[PDB]
Amino acid sequence: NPRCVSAYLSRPSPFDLFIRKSPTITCLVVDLAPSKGTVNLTWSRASGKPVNHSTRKEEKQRNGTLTVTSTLPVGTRDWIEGETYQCRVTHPHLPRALMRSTTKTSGPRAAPEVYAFATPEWPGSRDKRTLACLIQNFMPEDISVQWLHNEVQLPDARHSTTQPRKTKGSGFFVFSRLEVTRAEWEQKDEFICRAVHEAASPSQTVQRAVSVNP
Amino acid sequence: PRCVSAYLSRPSPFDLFIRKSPTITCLVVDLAPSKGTVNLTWSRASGKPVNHSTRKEEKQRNGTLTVTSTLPVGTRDWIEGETYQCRVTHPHLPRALMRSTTKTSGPRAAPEVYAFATPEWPGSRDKRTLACLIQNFMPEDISVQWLHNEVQLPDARHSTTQPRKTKGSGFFVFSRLEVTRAEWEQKDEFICRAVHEAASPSQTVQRAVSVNP
Amino acid sequence: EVQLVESGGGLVQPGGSLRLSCAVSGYSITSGYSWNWIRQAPGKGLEWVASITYDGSTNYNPSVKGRITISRDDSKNTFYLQMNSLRAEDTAVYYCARGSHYFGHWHFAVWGQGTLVTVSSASTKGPSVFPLAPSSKSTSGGTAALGCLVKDYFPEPVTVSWNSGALTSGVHTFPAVLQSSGLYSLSSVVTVPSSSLGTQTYICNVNHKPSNTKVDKKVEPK
Amino acid sequence: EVQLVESGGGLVQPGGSLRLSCAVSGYSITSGYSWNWIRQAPGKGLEWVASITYDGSTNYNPSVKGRITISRDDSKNTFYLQMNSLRAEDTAVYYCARGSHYFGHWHFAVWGQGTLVTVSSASTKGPSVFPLAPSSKSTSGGTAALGCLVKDYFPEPVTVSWNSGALTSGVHTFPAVLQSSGLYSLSSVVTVPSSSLGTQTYICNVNHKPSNTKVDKKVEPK
Amino acid sequence: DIQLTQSPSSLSASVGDRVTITCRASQSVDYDGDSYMNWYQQKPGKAPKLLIYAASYLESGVPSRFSGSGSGTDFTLTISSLQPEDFATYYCQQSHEDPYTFGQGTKVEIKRTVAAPSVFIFPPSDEQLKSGTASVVCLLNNFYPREAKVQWKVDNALQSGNSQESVTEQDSKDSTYSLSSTLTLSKADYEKHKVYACEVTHQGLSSPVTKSFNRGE
Amino acid sequence: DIQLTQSPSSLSASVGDRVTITCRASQSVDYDGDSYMNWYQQKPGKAPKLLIYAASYLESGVPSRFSGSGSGTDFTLTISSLQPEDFATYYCQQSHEDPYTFGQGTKVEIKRTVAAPSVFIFPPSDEQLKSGTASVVCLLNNFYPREAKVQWKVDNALQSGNSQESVTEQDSKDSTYSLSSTLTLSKADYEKHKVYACEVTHQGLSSPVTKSFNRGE
Ligand SMILES: *[C@@H]1O[C@H](CO)[C@@H](O[C@@H]2O[C@H](CO)[C@@H](O[C@@H]3O[C@H](CO[C@H]4O[C@H](CO)[C@@H](O)[C@H](O)[C@@H]4O)[C@@H](O)[C@H](O[C@H]4O[C@H](CO)[C@@H](O)[C@H](O)[C@@H]4O)[C@@H]3O)[C@H](O)[C@H]2NC(C)=O)[C@H](O)[C@H]1NC(C)=O
Ligand SMILES: *[C@@H]1O[C@H](CO)[C@@H](O[C@@H]2O[C@H](CO)[C@@H](O[C@@H]3O[C@H](CO[C@H]4O[C@H](CO)[C@@H](O)[C@H](O)[C@@H]4O)[C@@H](O)[C@H](O[C@H]4O[C@H](CO)[C@@H](O)[C@H](O)[C@@H]4O)[C@@H]3O)[C@H](O)[C@H]2NC(C)=O)[C@H](O)[C@H]1NC(C)=O
């Protein structure tokens, strides 16, 4: 397993883009050697406008490699108009610089269909139940999912969301999994599965409620 | 950027417990076609001979070559904890690559199976979507099938996610199956079946679901 | 998507002046990017002429600097090229293009179709349009050839379409040739199923903007 | 230096037999290296035909194999190509070449100039040689053009020299053209100072081996 | 000014073949770890299209068979598998120093199998025959290679100095050419004679082809 | 058998420019750390000359501006600084497996400045007129580019179907072409008429040039 220095550049999450209205993009560089020098990581915009102060972050990994990230805030309108942002990575040990670019993404648009389910009780799990959410037939593939219980949004660490996979049609689908406790559904037996997607009209939101005991 | 990488899989629980014809596959990625072919060889810790592997090469969209080798293994050999090794040599590497695989060790827990159907709504009248949540199993090796009318549907009719960790100790997966009106009118019962070594007996667990209950 | 459309081209007298305009749509020319003029004289290579960035900074090629001006009209989302003391060597197709930025340098990622500027002491003349009639037994391929002769015009260009753009397949519009008279001439031809000669009507639509000419000649068998 | 000269080419009937010989000088064909025949059909690429090593080991191209034989004569330091059942496809320029060895593989480091083999049922015909006389209509300023018309021969080739090889600069011997008569024709021309027309003698030396024709035509002005 | 030289000036290659175009700069266009040379494609009648910027980065929507390399003063554009629609002139262009400058261009022609022309002849229209001039047009359609010969014969009397030719660029789908030959006569001379013939010679024709008509029929 | 494909099929480049030829083999010609691909140069009228053997090794006496590279199935010949004498057809050739095979060849032409032809005309010899035939010859000497037009006019009557042309290959020193046009007549028809003219049109000529003579002088 040789370690190859690779770079990645994400798009803003629909949540940061449409809800918090604080969109950001992140340049991720992996498989760096700690004992080697540090990388120079710079940004550029197609419009020629200046870029904002990005926030840099480095992390030692268990597999003995270094991970460098740079997060850049972008204008909401700028991004949506269809601006192109670029990240460039240089290292004296790297033969050739790395460059990745990101943009709005174009193509057909379809709002997501949301379905929420609760698992029946299992022998053993007296006080645990699992909630699941199917979100499908949306495009493009960018989508954000949150879980709300008692009108407050749960921490992102409480639930797991799969990556977008292609349907047999043209759209995409994702699954979301949320483990809940008796204390929670007894306080209030309503859990909201919310999806944020650019094609959802209006306010880029679609959601469904589910109950353990209906 | 081009990174020469090698991977070596374990047998699917289906091939292992049902077909009783388990195989392991050594995958090599990011090769240059005109640079000649790689040498891919197998080995066993016991020293016993390896069966004839099937080699397979395919050019990729990104202009690289992908080489795979699938090796049939004895069911009893594997379950008793034999170790199989794959080695890749190329004149240009020139340090060889080696991957190894063996029976899984650790705690074992059977999978819990739940199946759900999406409600009817205009647009999806002649189609419905079935979903299956399989969770709290370990180890992560698992194969999933869908059966309708007691015949097993072909793979590729459904999509199955890879195992991720629960908040507990087990793993989970999701399975998605689009079904047609013609089928649930023929028979409104669809089985989501999981094959897992900790499932008692016959390494099988399943759950049924109906479009119109 | 961004679109760029040039206008103001055509015939100009030697020593005369030139005003080209680039109408931009889909993006605001004050919002970003660079905005350039590039020209291509007949049978020759490309020459960058002038540019204006979104913040108003201008730049010119020394080859033509001093008789040249680039400017913009924000309300019209248009930018302009002004040239004076024109010579025959200024005869060229003038493109406008939007430059995209990459770490301190620009590249021309989006172009317009370009407009022809002709410098000559000749007069404008609209074309005559004559039909090239298809024959009986025109082809063994069961296909028939017909066309329009677009004769005696100046300057370039003329544009030719068939059935108002409905018919595009099989069409060959030949390059204009300068006749000894000093006027241009070309033909546009199309192959069609001979079975359709009775049923289908074939019209060639000829436009010569310099002379404000627009003609629709129906080509019938004989 | 090693030198290879092939001979035996010329006209051959279809189904007839062919012997080409490569006389080698400067090196002994039993001392080392491989000795090969390579052919080049008109307007097509090169095809390796046969080889013989210094120890007599032979090799053949299966494409042409079974109707061919390669051999040698040490006393004459020559090696030969024998072909039977000749076909129109065998019409080609045949080269002999010495292959040099490199770790189990050979490459052709020395070549002969080649000989043309023409397969046809027509008969050989020697050329008529006519002068292209220089005159004021063939004089530009200080240079005058003169030449020889080599007409009606078969098969190819003819060889043309001027003043027995003394005059080479400014000489242009054109490719032969097949006339409708089925016979070949060409011209050889040379430009010279018009001042030399009175003083200097110009002789074209025409050779057509297939018919054993040898001509020396003096070209005089006017 | 930074001068750019391209080679070859022109080339002919078959479908599926690799094409290589070189650009040399009079001075280095390197700056801060990147080389600022751009590549453009200009098809007939169209404006230049950006293929590659900053030496090796592919513009969005551009086929992957286009690739760029090089640095300093030495740059290379590669077309890995040539296609009929790739018929164009390719330009390199430096954006490192003002004024921006282009190379002189490289013409890429497609080599294909020989194809004889379909020949057509067109009498002058009755409309034009009211105008004073008579134009007889001969069409050579869909042929290759570009080289062709057209002879006009009025009552078998060969014509010269009264005809003009025009040739299309190579077609982007089948890589053929088309040619038009226009014979220009006075109305008086046109009516004075009966037979009008267009004789075509081409590499794909075993025998010269003649298309003709009789005036009045 | 190993098949070899070369590209481009043909190219035109200027003196001093880099030329690049690619050779593709149907299977690998590698063995024991070497690649057994050879490159040859064939100038007009001459036999092939070895430039490179085993992919990258320069044959003795070959200029250093020739270099080879590549391996497996991918090979490249480079001419770093093209010279007029480099006008030739270049062949790749594999020596890895019997039978040895050559590529189809790549023609390298030199691009130079335009040069107008010097036109010369030659009446038939008295010697030929006794054979019954009369050949009139027109010479276009040392011009560029290759494209030229030659018209034969006998007493101002244009000729066709009774003339043939031949063109030299590009000269190895000044990269020009020369052309001959031969008008063939019977003695009877030749002695019938008075004026024989050769009209030449070329890109280097502002006006078509005519060379002619009167029979008997
Ligand atoms: C040592 O350990 C570290 C940490 O675990 C590893 O770092 C990981 O490296 C892999 C690749 O080597 C990274 O995976 C890639 O991530 C890209 C972006 O990932 C993030 O993006 C968002 C926001 O964070 C999340 O959705 C996502 O989960 C990640 O957080 C992807 O763009 C890549 O996509 C891949 O798949 C797609 C299609 O599925 C392809 O189109 C792509 O080309 C690509 O193949 C990819 O998934 C991972 O993010 C890294 N993690 C961290 C924390 O840095 C080292 O790899 C490991 N090294 C060794 C030698 O052991
Ligand atoms: C050109 O295009 C090809 C085709 O897409 C790319 O090849 C892929 O390369 C990536 C990484 O370079 C491979 O990703 C890895 O696949 C391993 C094999 O798992 C598969 O096993 C079977 C059979 O395929 C199935 O279960 C399933 O299809 C799996 O994909 C994985 O084991 C790897 O796991 C990684 O992720 C986990 C967590 O997510 C980590 O813990 C691991 O350590 C590891 O990082 C990984 O997913 C991919 O399989 C290749 N696909 C094919 C078809 O060969 C080339 O990479 C691409 N070239 C370039 C330059 O991008």
Numbering used by the authors:
A (entry chain G): 332 to 545
B (entry chain I): 333 to 545
C (entry chain A), D (entry chain H): 1 to 222
E (entry chain B), F (entry chain L): 1 to 217
Task: Please quote the paper that reports this structure.
IgE antibodies are central to most allergic reactions, and bind to high-affinity receptors (FcɛRI) present on mast cells and basophils, sensitizing these cells to respond to allergens. All three domains affect IgE receptor binding, yet the Cɛ3–4 fragment independently binds FcɛRI and CD23 and contains the residues involved in IgE receptor interactions. Omalizumab acts primarily by neutralizing free serum IgE. To understand the structural basis of omalizumab:IgE interactions and its ability to inhibit both FcɛRI and CD23 binding, we determined the structure of the omalizumab Fab bound to a disulfide bond mutant of the IgE-Fc Cɛ3-Cɛ4 fragment (IgE-G335C-Fc3–4) to 2.5 Å.
Analysis of the structure revealed that the omalizumab–Fab approaches perpendicularly to the IgE Cɛ3 domain, in contrast to recently proposed models, and contacts symmetric binding sites on the face of the two Cɛ3 domains of the IgE dimer. These contacts are predominantly formed between the omalizumab–Fab and Cɛ3 β-sheet residues below the FcɛRIα-binding loops (FG, BC and DE). Instead, the omalizumab–Fab is positioned between the binding sites of both FcɛRI and CD23, blocking interactions with both receptors, with the heavy chain proximal to the CD23 site, and the light chain proximal to the FcɛRIα-binding sites. All NCS copies shared the majority of contacts, which extend along the length of the Cɛ3 domain, involve 23 IgE residues and bury ∼725 Å2 of surface area on IgE. As predicted, alignment of the structures of IgE:omalizumab and IgE-Fc2-4:FcɛRIα complexes demonstrates that the Cɛ2 domains overlap extensively with an otherwise exposed omalizumab-binding epitope in the IgE-Fc3–4:FcɛRIα structure.
